[PDB]
Design a protein around this nucleic acid. Structure first.
Lengths: 147, 147
DNA sequence: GGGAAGCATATGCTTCCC
DNA sequence: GGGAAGCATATGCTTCCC
């Protein structure tokens, strides 16, 4: 258990655990066959996913990759803190919490709203920490030119 | 040169290098003296910064921290690839590039729009790779509940 | 101020346990 | 399908180069 297997960052493949999550997402995405890709091929919309636990978000990230060939995903990363309570001292902009997040890039705003409804639906019937994963649609004013 | 200096992730302080960057950002933001915080204190918008090179983005990130105590910053992370041209297969949603990004969370959409302009203005006068840094405003439909 | 060094420690990945 | 182990290699952070 543990160690190196020869698979680098971003090289994760599929296994039954991730595929089960993918099949759950696919059944949910299938409630709305909306357009996922455009002629322009621009990444103008997204979905910001955060919370739950490190493993529950990681697992969601892996399953989404299998469920949607048309999206592009970031590695997991960390969120900074919000507003501290009171007229007291605020945390510095750079301070990081233990809470993770990841971003999903999509070509349409309509598909982004669908993915977001799928993730919230898939997670609402699960026990903590999974049920505590949060999601929001993100509109990029100028789009993101992914390399 | 190199090694441990007792400063953990998110603990960066200030030094003339980052203060110099901060001062340039400050002078630009001062022409547009808008509100940076709301009373509901919710994080509803952001500035998605990317490209350039790992160091120039990092330095911009540290300077932004000093210039804006009212914002919040994620660590640097990596961007997936985009669309391949042609009828063939596309890269997997998880594949990562060497290209970095970071996100600035803000309380108002007006201030994100102003912050974006200032960053584009700061960077456009400089040599490569810094002038290659890209910026876009991000609107969070349901906001982001920072820890 | 961009780039490199280099410790501490972050995630990406897999396989195993429950 | 959540949590952990544990190698490889990511960034955070500094000081020094230049």
């Amino acid at each position: 258990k543990g160690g190196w297997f020869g698979k680098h960052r971003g090289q994760g493949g599929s296994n039954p655990k991730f595929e089960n999550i993918a099949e759950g997402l696919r059944a949910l995405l299938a409630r709305s066959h909306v357009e996922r890709t455009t002629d322009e091929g621009t990444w103008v919309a997204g979905v910001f996913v955060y919370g739950g636990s490190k493993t529950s978000l990681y697992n969601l990230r892996r399953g989404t990759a299998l469920a949607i060939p048309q999206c592009r995903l970031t590695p997991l990363s960390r969120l900074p803190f919000g507003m501290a309570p009171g007229p007291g001292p605020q945390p510095g902009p750079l301070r990081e919490s233990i809470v993770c997040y990841f971003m999903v890039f999509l070509q349409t705003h309509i598909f982004a709203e669908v993915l977001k409804d799928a993730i919230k639906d898939l997670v609402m019937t699960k026990p903590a920490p999974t049920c505590n994963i949060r999601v929001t649609v993100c509109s990029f004013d100028d789009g993101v030119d992914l390399p």
